[PDB]
Design an enzyme around this catalytic site. Sequence first.
Site, short mmCIF file in Angstrom:
data_model
loop_
_atom_site.label_atom_id
_atom_site.label_comp_id
_atom_site.label_asym_id
_atom_site.label_seq_id
_atom_site.Cartn_x
_atom_site.Cartn_y
_atom_site.Cartn_z
CB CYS A 28 108.73 -51.75 -98.66
SG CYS A 28 109.19 -50.86 -100.16
CE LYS A 55 104.32 -57.10 -106.07
NZ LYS A 55 105.24 -56.62 -107.13
CB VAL A 68 104.38 -50.67 -101.62
CG1 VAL A 68 103.13 -51.53 -101.64
CG2 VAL A 68 105.61 -51.48 -101.17
CD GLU A 81 108.03 -44.66 -109.88
OE1 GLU A 81 109.28 -44.80 -109.85
OE2 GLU A 81 107.25 -45.56 -110.25
CB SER A 82 109.63 -43.98 -102.76
OG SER A 82 110.82 -44.02 -103.54
#
EC number: 2.5.1.18
Lengths: 237, 237
Positions: A28, A55, A68, A81-82
Site C-alpha cells: 500500500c 478484511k 490502511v 488517514e495517511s
Amino acid sequence: SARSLGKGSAPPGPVPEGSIRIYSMRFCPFAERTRLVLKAKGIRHEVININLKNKPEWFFKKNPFGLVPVLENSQGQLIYESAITCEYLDEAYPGKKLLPDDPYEKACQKMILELFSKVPSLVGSFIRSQNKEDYAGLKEEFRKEFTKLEEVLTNKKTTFFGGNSISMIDYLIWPWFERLEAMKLNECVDHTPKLKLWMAAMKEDPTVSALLTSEKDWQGFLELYLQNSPEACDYGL
Amino acid sequence: SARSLGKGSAPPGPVPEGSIRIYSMRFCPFAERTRLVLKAKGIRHEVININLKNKPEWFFKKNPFGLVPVLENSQGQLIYESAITCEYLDEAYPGKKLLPDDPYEKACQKMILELFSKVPSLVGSFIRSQNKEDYAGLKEEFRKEFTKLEEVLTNKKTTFFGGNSISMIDYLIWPWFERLEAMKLNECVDHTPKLKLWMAAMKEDPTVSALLTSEKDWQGFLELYLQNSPEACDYGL
Ligand SMILES: *CC(=O)Nc1ccc(Cl)c(S(=O)(=O)N(C)C)c1
Ligand SMILES: *CC(=O)Nc1ccc(Cl)c(S(=O)(=O)N(C)C)c1
C-alpha cells in the site's frame, strides 16, 4: 508473522507501553508514507498487515473507512488517514522534525500535497486498463500534473520540495514515484528535469532506500491485485 | 467598495504592514471558513472580493487553481486552500488557539473534517437539479453522511466537535449547515438529534451570528448563480 490478517482472525488486543501499532499492507503506497515517517523518526512500533481483499470484521472498529494505514497507541487512541498519521507521528514523537516549525513553510508543504492530489487516481486508471489506445492520453494527463510539481522546484530553486534537505512532503509524495519505473511510466517525467533529478536524489536517502520494494515484487502484487486474489497482499512470502 | 473585481480590473498592489489580505467572495462557503477564523482571532485584514463568473487575469498569479479563499501578507507570501488558510491563521497570529495543542486532539479535528468530506459535493448536486424525483435519493445520501457526524458527537459526549467550547472544526464545517434551511433540507437532520442541537448552539456563537448571511440573500445569489450571471457574486448591493 508479517502475513496479513483476514476474515476469521482474532482482534490484536492491547498495544503495549512504549510502542505504537500500525495497521498496514506491505504494498500500500498510502500506508508506506506512515512507515517512512516511523523509520525516519526511529519510532518503536509493531506492524500488523491487513488483507485488503478479505478484511477482518474487527478492522472496521479501528477505522470506519476500513482502510490502511491506521495508528493505535497504548491508551487505545486511533488515528487514520495517511497524511494525518504522518503529522501525528511528527508532533507526538521527538527527534528531527519532518514538518517545519514555520507556519508558512508548513502551509507550503500542504499546498504541494494538494498539487499532487490527482496522481494516485491517475496511477489507478493506468493500472486498470482495457486497451493500449488510452495509454498515450493518460501519459499526457500525468505530464499535466507532473508539470505542477516542476514549477514548485523551479520557483523554490531547491533540490527537495521542502528545502535543501529531505522533509515530510518528499516522503508523502514518494511512494507513487517509486512505482513509476515498474509500471513503465519513466517517459512521463521527460519534460520535468528538476522532478527527474529529485527522484534519483530521493532513491539515495537511507530511509527511502531501506523501505524500497523491488520492481518484480510490485509487478507480482499488481498481477494478483488485477486478479482480485486474497494472496495479493501476501505476495513474496 | 465590497464589489467583486473581474476582467479588466487592475492588480491590487502590495499588502501593507500590520495587515493580511483575503481574496474572498461573500457567498463562498469555503472562503467563509477563513473569514470566520479572521473574525474569531480578531486579525486586522483587508477583503478583496473576486467575481468567480468573470475572474481577473491577475487572480491566477495569486492561486494557480483560481479559487477563493487566498491569503496574502506584507512579505508577499501566498496561502490557498480554505483548510490551509485557517491552520496558517491559527499558527501565525496570537490569541485563543482555535486548534488544540494536543497532537491527538489536532488529528481528531482533521479526521472529523474527512468524515464531512462528501457534504459540499452533495449540496452541489441538490442545487443543480433537473427533477423532483432525485430529491428523496439525495436526502438519503445526506442522512448517510450526517449520521457519520452524529456518531462523533455521541462518542465524545460533548456539545461541539472539538469539546465543550467551540473550536476550528466547528467553523470549518458550519458554512454548509448555515445554508441547509435556505435550501429546505432541515429534514435531513431529523435522525441526528445531537447534530441538530449543535446547529442551534452554533447559531448563538457571536462569531457565527456576525458573519451569517440571510435566507433570501443566499436564495437570491443561488438564483443568479444557476443563471451563470456575472452579477451573482455582487447580489445585494
Ligand atoms: C493501500 C492501497 O490503497 N493500496 C493500493 C494498491 C494498489 C494501487 Cl495501484 C494503489 S493506487 O494508489 O495506485 N490506487 C488507489 C489504485 C493503492
Ligand atoms: C467559493 C465557492 O465555491 N462557492 C460556492 C458557491 C455556491 C455553491 Cl452551491 C457552493 S457548494 O459548496 O455548494 N458547491 C461547490 C457547489 C460553493
